[PDB]
Amino acid sequence: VYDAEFVGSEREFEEERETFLKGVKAYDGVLATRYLMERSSSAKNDEELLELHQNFILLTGSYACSIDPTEDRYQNVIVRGVNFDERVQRLSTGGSPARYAIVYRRGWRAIAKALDIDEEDVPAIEVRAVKRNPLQPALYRILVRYGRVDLMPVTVDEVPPEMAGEFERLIERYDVPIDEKEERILEILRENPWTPHDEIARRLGLSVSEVEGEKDPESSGIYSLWSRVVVNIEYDERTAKRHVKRRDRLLEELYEHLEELSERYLRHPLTRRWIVEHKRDIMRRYLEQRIVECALKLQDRYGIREDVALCLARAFDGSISMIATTPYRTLKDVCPDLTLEEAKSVNRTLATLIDEHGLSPDAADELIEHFE
- Binding residues for Mg(2+) are 263, 266
**Class of residue 97 by CB neighbours under 10 A (exposed 0-12, middle 13-18, buried 19+):** buried
Q: Does 70 bind Cl ion (CB under 5 A)?
A: no
Which residue lies nearer to Mg ion by CB, 58 or 346? 346
Which range of residues in 12-20, 97-105, 115-123, 258-266 is near Mg ion by CB under 5 A? 258-266
Q: Does 263 bind Mg ion (CB under 5 A)?
A: yes
Q: Can you tell me the distance from the alpha carbon of 121 to that of 143, in angstroms, rounded to the nearest whole number?
A: 27
Q: Does 319 bind Mg ion (CB under 5 A)?
A: no
List 5, 6, 7, 10, residue binding Cl ion (CB under 5 A): 10
Helix 137-145 vs helix 47-65: crossing angle, to nearest 10: 30
List 2, 74, 84, 286, residue binding Cl ion (CB under 5 A): 2
Show binding-site residues.
263, 266
Report the Cα 137 to chain-centroid distance in Å: 9
Which residue lies nearer to Cl ion by CB, 9 or 70? 9
Which range of residues in 2-10, 138-146, 195-203, 246-254 is near Cl ion by CB under 5 A? 2-10
Which residue lies nearer to Mg ion by CB, 40 or 75? 40
Percent composition of the chain: helix, strand, coil (DSSP 3-state, to 5): 65, 5, 35
Q: Quick one: what does residue 10 bind among Cl ion, Mg ion, none, with the CB cut-off 5 to 8 Å set by partner type?
A: Cl ion
Q: Quick one: what does residue 207 bind among Cl ion, Mg ion, none, with the CB cut-off 5 to 8 Å set by partner type?
A: Mg ion
Shortest reach from residue 13's CB to Cl ion, in Å: 8
Q: Can you tell me the distance from the alpha carbon of 83 to that of 352, in angstroms, rounded to the nearest whole number?
A: 24
* DSSP assignments along 94-149, one per residue: ---HHHHHHTSTTHHHHHHHHTT--SSSS--------TT-SS-HHHHHHHHHTT-T
DSSP reduced 3-state for 268:
coil
Q: Can you tell me the distance from the alpha carbon of 236 to that of 62, in angstroms, rounded to the nearest whole number?
A: 14
Q: Does 324 bind Mg ion (CB under 5 A)?
A: yes
Q: Does 79 bind Mg ion (CB under 5 A)?
A: no
Q: Does 9 bind Cl ion (CB under 5 A)?
A: yes
Q: Can you tell me the distance from the alpha carbon of 101 to that of 66, in angstroms, rounded to the nearest whole number?
A: 14
Q: Does 208 bind Mg ion (CB under 5 A)?
A: yes
Of the candidates 356, 366, 355, the one whose C-alpha atom is nearest the C-alpha of residue 330 is 366
Which range of residues in 129-137, 260-268, 275-283, 329-337 is near Mg ion by CB under 5 A? 260-268
Shortest reach from residue 342's CB to Mg ion, in Å: 12
Other beta carbons within 10 angstroms of residue 235's beta carbon come to: 12
Give the binding site for Mg ion (CB under 5 A): 207-208, 263, 324, 347-348
Give the binding site for Cl ion (CB under 5 A): 2, 9-11
